[PDB]
Enzyme design. Structure first.
Site, short mmCIF file in Angstrom:
data_model
loop_
_atom_site.label_atom_id
_atom_site.label_comp_id
_atom_site.label_asym_id
_atom_site.label_seq_id
_atom_site.Cartn_x
_atom_site.Cartn_y
_atom_site.Cartn_z
N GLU A 213 0.85 -1.18 -0.02
CA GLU A 213 0.03 -0.03 0.06
C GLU A 213 0.84 1.14 -0.06
O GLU A 213 0.53 2.34 -0.68
CB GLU A 213 -1.01 0.18 1.13
CG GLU A 213 -2.19 -0.91 1.03
CD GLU A 213 -3.14 -0.70 0.08
OE1 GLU A 213 -4.10 -1.44 -0.09
OE2 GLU A 213 -2.87 0.35 -0.73
N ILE B 21 -5.54 12.46 5.38
CA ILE B 21 -5.29 11.17 4.47
C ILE B 21 -4.93 10.00 5.62
O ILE B 21 -5.39 9.01 5.05
CB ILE B 21 -4.11 11.73 3.60
CG1 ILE B 21 -4.40 12.38 2.67
CG2 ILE B 21 -3.14 10.45 3.61
CD1 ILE B 21 -3.25 13.23 1.77
N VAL C 150 -8.56 9.04 7.60
CA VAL C 150 -10.14 9.05 7.25
C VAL C 150 -10.16 8.40 5.90
O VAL C 150 -9.28 8.29 5.04
CB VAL C 150 -10.40 10.50 6.73
CG1 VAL C 150 -11.92 10.62 6.23
CG2 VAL C 150 -10.42 11.77 8.09
N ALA D 136 -10.71 9.11 1.76
CA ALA D 136 -10.26 10.78 1.57
C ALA D 136 -8.84 10.39 0.95
O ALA D 136 -7.93 9.53 1.18
CB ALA D 136 -9.82 10.93 2.95
N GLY E 267 -6.51 12.00 -2.85
CA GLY E 267 -6.36 12.99 -4.10
C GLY E 267 -6.73 12.23 -5.49
O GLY E 267 -6.10 12.74 -6.55
N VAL F 140 -3.36 3.96 2.70
CA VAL F 140 -2.30 4.26 3.84
C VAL F 140 -2.98 4.43 5.04
O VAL F 140 -2.31 4.30 6.33
CB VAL F 140 -1.49 5.48 3.49
CG1 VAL F 140 -2.18 6.91 3.65
CG2 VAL F 140 -0.19 5.43 4.19
N1 ANP Z 1 3.92 9.06 -1.14
C1 ANP Z 1 2.88 10.07 -1.40
N2 ANP Z 1 3.21 11.16 -1.90
C2 ANP Z 1 2.29 12.06 -2.33
N3 ANP Z 1 0.77 11.83 -1.86
C3 ANP Z 1 0.63 10.78 -1.24
C4 ANP Z 1 1.49 9.75 -1.17
N4 ANP Z 1 0.85 8.81 -0.18
C5 ANP Z 1 -0.25 9.19 -0.09
N5 ANP Z 1 -0.57 10.37 -0.79
C6 ANP Z 1 -1.82 11.11 -0.82
O1 ANP Z 1 -2.76 10.26 0.15
C7 ANP Z 1 -3.83 9.91 -0.54
C8 ANP Z 1 -4.74 8.80 0.16
O2 ANP Z 1 -3.92 7.73 0.13
P1 ANP Z 1 -4.44 6.22 0.58
O3 ANP Z 1 -5.35 6.17 1.78
O4 ANP Z 1 -3.42 5.39 0.04
O5 ANP Z 1 -5.49 6.21 -0.55
P2 ANP Z 1 -5.44 6.20 -2.38
O6 ANP Z 1 -4.02 5.99 -2.70
O7 ANP Z 1 -5.83 7.70 -2.84
N6 ANP Z 1 -6.26 5.12 -2.97
P3 ANP Z 1 -6.29 3.43 -2.41
O8 ANP Z 1 -4.62 3.40 -2.01
O9 ANP Z 1 -6.62 2.61 -3.45
O10 ANP Z 1 -7.03 3.07 -1.19
C9 ANP Z 1 -3.68 9.65 -1.90
O11 ANP Z 1 -4.87 9.85 -2.83
C10 ANP Z 1 -2.60 10.88 -2.19
O12 ANP Z 1 -3.26 12.12 -2.52
K K Z 2 -7.17 7.82 3.26
MG MG Z 3 -2.95 4.37 -2.19
#
Ligand code: ANP
Ligand code: K
Ligand code: MG
Ligand code: ANP
Ligand code: CL
Ligand code: CL
Ligand code: K
Ligand code: MG
Ligand code: NA
Ligand code: NA
Lengths: 384, 384
Positions: B39, B91, B94, B97, B99, B117
Site C-alpha cells: 500500500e 489522509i 479518514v 479520503a 487525491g 495508507v
Molecule cells: N507518497 C505519497 N506522495 C504523495 N501523496 C501521497 C503519497 N501517499 C499518499 N498520498 C496522498 O494520500 C492520498 C490517500 O492515500 P491512500 O489512503 O492510500 O488512498 P489512495 O492512494 O488515494 N487510494 P487506495 O490506495 O486505492 O485506497 C492519496 O490519494 C494521495 O493524494
Molecule cells: K485515506
Molecule cells: Mg493508496
C-alpha cells in the site's frame, strides 16, 4: 497544483457510488446486480439464524425491483441518541453501522461489516422500507440513498418483520439490468437446505412463476440433491455436526462415478465461491485420513487430487467473528477455521470409514482408480 | 433486547481494526502483513506514474518496521479547510479520503479508494510520517492511528518527497509477523520492469542485504527475465503499447518448451493475482487470432487451453477509473477493459504473425503438439 485543496473526503454513501466494485463487485455482468438481493436476503437469514424468522419471501416485481419480506424482529425504529435519527435510518445511510459488531443481537451472523444494506440503498434509485415492530407499522422511502422523510408510523399490526424493496440505479448497473429467476432460485434453494424449518418463497410477478423451498434433511439432503442427476458409488453419505472451541463445523459428502470435484463451502450461511481456510482444512483432513486408512488397511501413491475426483461435499461452518477478504465474501481468510475443520474432519471421517466398511472399500477403489487414470494420462502426454 | 441501543456506528479507523480482512486480507499467513508495505509502495509508484518520482527506497529495519522513501511531490501539508487539520492527517486518519477521486493530481493511478495508507496507519502500533515540501520538513507520529501531535515543521530542505515508516500491530497480525525480503523483492523487481527510469532500492538492515532494481527494457525485458531459466521456442517476443479510447494496453509474450501457462496481469501497475476482465480479453483475443491464422494458413480442433501451454505473457493496462472487487485489488472487474485488450490484441497479434513467419510456424506447431498431448491423455484416461 497538488495541495490540500486536492484532497477530498467522500461522505455518507458517496464512496459507494464512486467505487462500486469494492462494495458490490461487477456492475456490468449481473453478478453485482443479484448481489444487491443477496445482501438483503442475508440480513433476513441472520434473523433466522438468531431464532426469530421462520418465513422469507422474495418477490421479483414487474417493474424490475425486488422485495424481501421477513417475519423477524424488525429493524429497530427508535431514535439513535448519538446519530439523532431513527436507528433504521442510521443503518440504511451509514457505512460500518449495525448490530453485528458484538454477539448480543445475533450470536452468529453472515453479516459482519455493517455495510450490506446501506450499499443496496446507495446504489438504488429508490428503496422502500417497511418495518413491523412493537405494535406498529413504520415506513420510509429513499432515493439514491437519500431519505425523503424521517421514518414514520403508518398504522398498527400484531406482527413483526422487515420488508425492503429496491429499484437498482442504472447510473451504476449496466448491461445485465434485469433479474434472473434461476440465479435467485439457486441461492434460495441452498439457503433452505442450510436453514431447516425456514420457509423460503420466491415469486416472479413478471410471469407468475413461484417456488416454495422448505427442504427436510439439511446438508445431508443437499448432498442427495446435488448427486440426483449423477450416480453415487456408495450408499452412506458421511455427515456430522459439531460445535467445539467456539466453532460449528458441519460436513456432508459422498462420491459419485464421475470425475468432477464439487465442494461447496459456507460460513454463517454465506457461500465462498473462492474457497478459503475452511476448504483448505477440509482438503488437508481428507488427504490425511484417507491416506492413514489405506496405510492401516494395506491398500498403499495417491494424492489429494485423486481423493477429489467424483467428490460432492458441503462444508458449513459457524463462526463468531469470521474474516472475509471482501464485502462480497467470496473467500474466508480465518486461519483458526482451517484448524477446526481439519481437526473435526480427521476425527469423524476416520470413524465413518471404520463404521462403514463397504463404503470405505468402494471409496479406496475409486481413489486407486483415479490415481491409475492420472498416471496413464501422464505417460500418454510424455509419449507424444 | 434488540433495539436502537443495539446499533453501533464505528468511527475513524475503528472499522479497520474490527474487520481487518476486508481491508488488508489474511492477518495470519503473512500476506496481509506484506500488503501493508505494498500500500505504501503503491502510493510512491503513483507519484512515479504521475511523472514526479524517480527514486523509491524500501528499508526493512532491524526492529521489524518498514520504511518507504520516495522523491515525489510530498503529501500535502496545508490545513484542510473542511476537516480543520493538515491534509496529511486527513489522509492518514479518514477512510475514502485522498487525491485520486479525479484525474487532476494523478492522471492514472493504482490508488483509487482513498483507503490504503489509512489502513496501514490503523493497523500499525506506530507510524512515522516525514514530508519534504515547499522548502520545509514536516513530521508527525501516530500510535494505533492516533496522531500524537499535529503535523509540525522541523527544518528546511531543497528536496521533495514522502517517507512513511510503520511498525505493524501484533494485536492484528499473528503468526507471520516478520518481513520476508524475497516477498518484497519480487514485487519491487516487477515494479522496476513496469516503471522504466525509476530507481527502486531495497535494503535489509537485519543482514545488510540490498538490491537496486532499474531494469532496461520494460515488459519485454520482464518476459525475458521470466523465461531466463526456461527454453523459449521462438526468438521474437511479441510486444506492443497503445493508448486507444482512453485505455493503455501494453502486452508482451513468448512461448517456451514447457507446459505451464503464466500470464501476469496488471492494472495501473497493481497485480491481479485473481485475474479479471483484462485476462478474459487477452484469452479471448489469443484464441480468436491464432484460430484465424491457422484457418487462413491451412493448419486446421485446438482450444484456448492448447494456446495457453508454454505461454509467458504480461498484460499491463492503464485505466482512468478501473474497478476492483476488493481493497487488495486481486481482481479487475471492469468490462470495458476486456474490450480494449481484446481489440488491441486481435489487431496487433495478427500483424505479428504475418511479420514473423518463422515464429508463427513454430507457435502453430506448439499448439498442435499441445492438442495432440491433450487428446492422448484423454484417450488414456478413458481406457483405464
Ligand atoms: N507518497 C505519497 N506522495 C504523495 N501523496 C501521497 C503519497 N501517499 C499518499 N498520498 C496522498 O494520500 C492520498 C490517500 O492515500 P491512500 O489512503 O492510500 O488512498 P489512495 O492512494 O488515494 N487510494 P487506495 O490506495 O486505492 O485506497 C492519496 O490519494 C494521495 O493524494
Ligand atoms: K485515506
Ligand atoms: Mg493508496
Ligand atoms: N431484516 C432485518 N431484520 C432486522 N435487523 C436488520 C435487518 N436487516 C438489517 N438489520 C440491521 O441492520 C444492520 C446493518 O445491516 P447491514 O448494513 O447489512 O450490515 P450488517 O448485516 O451488520 N453487515 P454486512 O452485511 O456484512 O455488511 C444489521 O447489523 C442489523 O442490525
Ligand atoms: Cl498544501
Ligand atoms: Cl428501537
Ligand atoms: K449499514
Ligand atoms: Mg448485512
Ligand atoms: Na457479531
Ligand atoms: Na483518479
Amino acid at each position: 497544483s497538488y495541495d490540500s485543496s486536492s484532497i477530498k473526503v467522500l461522505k455518507g454513501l458517496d464512496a459507494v457510488r464512486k467505487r462500486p466494485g469494492m462494495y458490490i463487485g461487477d456492475t456490468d455482468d449481473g453478478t453485482g446486480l443479484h448481489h444487491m438481493v443477496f445482501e438483503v436476503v442475508d440480513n433476513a437469514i441472520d434473523e433466522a439464524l438468531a431464532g426469530h424468522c421462520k418465513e422469507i419471501i422474495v418477490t421479483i416485481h414487474a417493474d424490475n425491483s425486488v422485495s424481501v419480506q421477513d417475519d423477524g424482529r424488525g429493524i429497530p425504529t427508535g431514535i439513535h441518541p448519538e446519530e439523532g435519527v431513527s436507528a433504521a435510518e442510521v443503518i440504511m445511510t451509514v457505512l460500518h453501522a449495525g448490530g453485528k459488531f458484538d454477539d448480543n443481537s445475533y450470536k452468529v451472523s453472515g453479516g459482519l461489516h455493517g455495510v450490506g444494506v446501506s450499499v443496496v440503498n446507495a446504489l438504488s434509485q429508490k428503496l422502500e422500507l417497511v418495518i413491523q415492530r412493537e405494535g406498529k407499522i413504520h415506513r420510509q422511502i429513499y432515493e439514491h440513498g437519500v431519505p425523503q422523510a424521517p421514518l414514520a408510523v403508518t398504522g398498527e399490526t400484531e406482527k413483526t418483520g422487515t420488508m425492503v424493496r429496491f429499484w437498482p440505479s442504472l447510473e451504476t448497473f449496466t448491461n445485465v439490468t434485469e433479474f434472473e429467476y434461476e440465479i435467485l432460485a439457486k441461492r434460495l434453494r441452498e439457503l433452505s437446505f442450510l436453514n431447516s424449518g425456514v420457509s423460503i418463497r420466491l415469486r416472479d410477478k413478471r410471469d407468475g412463476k413461484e417456488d416454495h423451498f422448505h427442504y427436510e434433511g439439511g446438508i445431508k439432503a443437499f448432498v442427495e440433491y446435488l448427486n440426483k442427476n449423477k450416480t453415487p458409488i456408495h450408499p452412506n453419505i458421511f455427515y456430522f455436526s459439531t460445535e467445539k472451541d467456539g466453532i460449528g463445523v458441519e460436513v456432508a459428502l459422498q462420491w459419485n462415478d464421475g470425475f468432477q470435484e464439487n465442494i461447496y463451502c459456507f460460513t454463517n450461511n454465506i457461500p465462498q465461491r473462492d474457497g478459503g481456510t475452511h476448504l483448505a482444512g477440509f482438503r488437508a483432513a481428507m488427504t490425511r485420513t484417507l491416506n492413514a486408512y489405506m496405510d492401516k488397511e494395506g491398500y498403499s501413491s495417491a494424492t489429494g487430487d485423486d481423493a477429489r475426483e467424483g467428490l460432492i461435499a458441503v462444508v458449513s461452518v459457524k463462526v463468531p467473528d469470521p474474516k472475509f477478504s471482501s464485502q462480497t465474501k467470496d473467500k474466508l481468510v480465518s486461519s483458526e477455521v482451517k484448524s477446526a475443520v481439519e481437526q473435526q474432519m480427521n476425527e469423524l471421517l476416520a470413524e465413518y470409514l471404520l463404521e462403514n466398511p463397504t463404503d470405505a472399500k468402494i471409496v479406496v477403489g475409486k481413489i486407486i482408480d483415479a490415481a491409475r487414470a492420472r498416471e496413464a494420462a501422464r505417460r500418454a502426454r510424455e509419449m507424444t
